[PDB]
Amino acid sequence: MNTVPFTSAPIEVTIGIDQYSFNVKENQPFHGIKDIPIGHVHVIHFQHADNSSMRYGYWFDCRMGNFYIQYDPKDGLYKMMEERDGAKFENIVHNFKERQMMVSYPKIDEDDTWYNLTEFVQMDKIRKIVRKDENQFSYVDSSMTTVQENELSDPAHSLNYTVINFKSREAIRPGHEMEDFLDKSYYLNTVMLQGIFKNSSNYFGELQFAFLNAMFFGNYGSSLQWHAMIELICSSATVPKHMLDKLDEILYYQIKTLPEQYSDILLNERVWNICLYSSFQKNSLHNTEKIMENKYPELL
Amino acid sequence: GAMNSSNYAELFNNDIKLFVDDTNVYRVTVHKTFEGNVATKAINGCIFTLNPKTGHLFLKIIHTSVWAGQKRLSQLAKWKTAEEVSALVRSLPKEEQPKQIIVTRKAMLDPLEVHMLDFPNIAIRPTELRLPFSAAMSIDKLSDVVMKATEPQMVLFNIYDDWLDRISSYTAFSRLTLLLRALKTNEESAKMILLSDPTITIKSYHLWPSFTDEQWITIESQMRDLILTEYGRKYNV
Numbered sequence: 001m002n003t004v005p006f007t008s009a010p011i012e013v014t015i016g017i018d019q020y021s022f023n024v025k026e027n028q029p030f031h032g033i034k035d036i037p038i039g040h041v042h043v044i045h046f047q048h049a050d051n052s053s054m055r056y057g058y059w060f061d062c063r064m065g066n067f068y069i070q071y072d073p074k075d076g077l078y079k080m081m082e083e084r085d086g087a088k089f090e091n092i093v094h095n096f097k098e099r100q101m102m103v104s105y106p107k108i109d110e111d112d113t114w115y116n117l118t119e120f121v122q123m124d125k126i127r128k129i130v131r132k133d134e135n136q137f138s139y140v141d142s143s144m145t146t147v148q149e150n151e152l153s154d155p156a157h158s159l160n161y162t163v164i165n166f167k168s169r170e171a172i173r174p175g176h177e178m179e180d181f182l183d184k185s186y187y188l189n190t191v192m193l194q195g196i197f198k199n200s201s202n203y204f205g206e207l208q209f210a211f212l213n214a215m216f217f218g219n220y221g222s223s224l225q226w227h228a229m230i231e232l233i234c235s236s237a238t239v240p241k242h243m244l245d246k247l248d249e250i251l252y253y254q255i256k257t258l259p260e261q262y263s264d265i266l267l268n269e270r271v272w273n274i275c276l277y278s279s280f281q282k283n284s285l286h287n288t289e290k291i292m293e294n295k296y297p298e299l300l
Numbered sequence: 301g302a303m304n305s306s307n308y309a310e311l312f313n314n315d316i317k318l319f320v321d322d323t324n325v326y327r328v329t330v331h332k333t334f335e336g337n338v339a340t341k342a343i344n345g346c347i348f349t350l351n352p353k354t355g356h357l358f359l360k361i362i363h364t365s366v367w368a369g370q371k372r373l374s375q376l377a378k379w380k381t382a383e384e385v386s387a388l389v390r391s392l393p394k395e396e397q398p399k400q401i402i403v404t405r406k407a408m409l410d411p412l413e414v415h416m417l418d419f420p421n422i423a424i425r426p427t428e429l430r431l432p433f434s435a436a437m438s439i440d441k442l443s444d445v446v447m448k449a450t451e452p453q454m455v456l457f458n459i460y461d462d463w464l465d466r467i468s469s470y471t472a473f474s475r476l477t478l479l480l481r482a483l484k485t486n487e488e489s490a491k492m493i494l495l496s497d498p499t500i501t502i503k504s505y506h507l508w509p510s511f512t513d514e515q516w517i518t519i520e521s522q523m524r525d526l527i528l529t530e531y532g533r534k535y536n537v
């Protein structure tokens with residue numbers, strides 16, 4: 001179980017760690033988060049009390065280094081950093097732990113929610129979507145735009161999700177125009193899975209990461225990507241059985257975790273109605289359809 | 301964006317553009333079967349592709365054999381329309397290719413966009429105008445070539461005859477849409493108006509009668525009367 005210490009908390013802030021959150025007051029003696037489960041990526045995120053604008057945060061994996069948070073009064077945000085001196089870090093964490101100045105990652109033993117939301121998410125893939133090669137962790141915020149959004153403006157600060165566009169030469173084989181547009185199986189299976197992602201695990205990892213950035217930061221382009229990757233599978237007549245079964249589980253846990261009050265902005269009515277009721281896969285997402293109908297029947 | 305009353309003169313500027321109407325591509329007669337069920341029988345159709353500035357009409361005749369063995373024909377017909385329009389564009393010299401294609405029905409937007417991906421600079425546009433191009437098969441010479449076709453065929457016409465020698469494109473289009481609206485609202489009466497006087501004939505190389513300028517004014521007024529009437533006869537007014 002790993003620890004992400006905090007130098008201090010000089011400004012009042014709501015701090016999230018994965019699906020949990022807690023409020024820290026200005027200059028409250030807070031020195032970090034302990035007992036973080038090893039084996040998963042994690043995200044530590046922030047919303048300042050004085051400016052609820054810009055939620056921001058950091059994706060990381062404690063197996064990759066020793067990370068800590070410190071407030072920068074010049075740039076005005078809590079920054080993640082890496083401590084290379086393993087002894088200075090161990091000693092700092094032990095000191096903070098002895099003084100009981102850390103919150104404990106509050107996981108219920110029965111609870112598989114975080115695993116189910118990050119099953120296919122890998123730090124190495126996060127670091128290719130979010131390019132900042134000098135750090136082992138990845139910053140994301142509410143305002144960052146995606147490569148596809150930019151095409152339609154700073155590249156170094158973009159979300160390099162895989163571009164999906166249903167009315168594009170990549171998606172449409174010359175001479176199979178109607179076929180490829182109405183059944184996207186060739187674009188899903190040959191172009192995207194065999195060609196770009198290599199396997200379904202990487203596809204699901206990017207889909208899961210997009211959802212999490214949409215939910216935790218309200219990142220609009222991430223929501224667009226999440227829905228595009230869902231629509232591409234649902235609009236394919238030929239999808240491996242194991243992928244449909246896994247997608248149903250993935251989306252079930254995403255819909256389960258979504259704040260009930262954010263459904264209006266984070267769920268695209270057209271995609272979900274098409275996917276659950278019109279598409280080739282309208283009958284292949286039993287768990288997702290049941291939770292959606294019981295939790296958000298208005299959208300449908 | 302969409303083409304409407306506000307940007308109507310754009311049709312007659314010098315940027316090449318084509319209207320595409322697909323309402324006569326897939327045509328059927330509905331009938332009873334021996335068992336008393338209902339079936340359809342297709343008849344030849346056509347794509348109506350029209351340059352509104354010059355009057356040039358590319359009438360692609362859709363022979364019933366294209367539907368043989370196919371399912372979901374009303375959906376296929378939109379994609380076949382877009383396939384044939386794309387093929388026509390590719391067949392034209394670059395300097396004759398359109399800069400915009402205006403579809404008369406919004407359901408043609410996605411099929412035509414996908415078929416024209418190779419032409420990113422050709423704008424595909426809908427329209428808010430309710431144009432009467434479905435009535436094209438009430439022009440006797442157009443209907444005749446469609447019904448006689450035994451194989452796919454493209455036939456070129458000038459839908460304005462020689463009118464542009466005397467009138468502008470704006471006026472010619474208005475006359476065309478008036479004639480077609482009349483034919484669509486009451487075909488029998490419209491055709492009576494156009495042929496009542498046997499001394500006014502249709503040249504072999506024309507579609508409409510050889511009216512003098514004064515006779516066109518009379519004709520056009522008779523068509524307006526017809527449309528307003530039917531509008532009464534319809535709504536009782």
Ligand SMILES: CCC1(CC)C(=O)NC(=O)N(C)C1=O
Pocket residue numbers: 005006007067068069083088089092
């Ligand atoms: C030794 C103090 C300090 C400040 C930079 C450090 O050097 N290394 C760390 O890992 N943390 C959390 C710290 O607070």
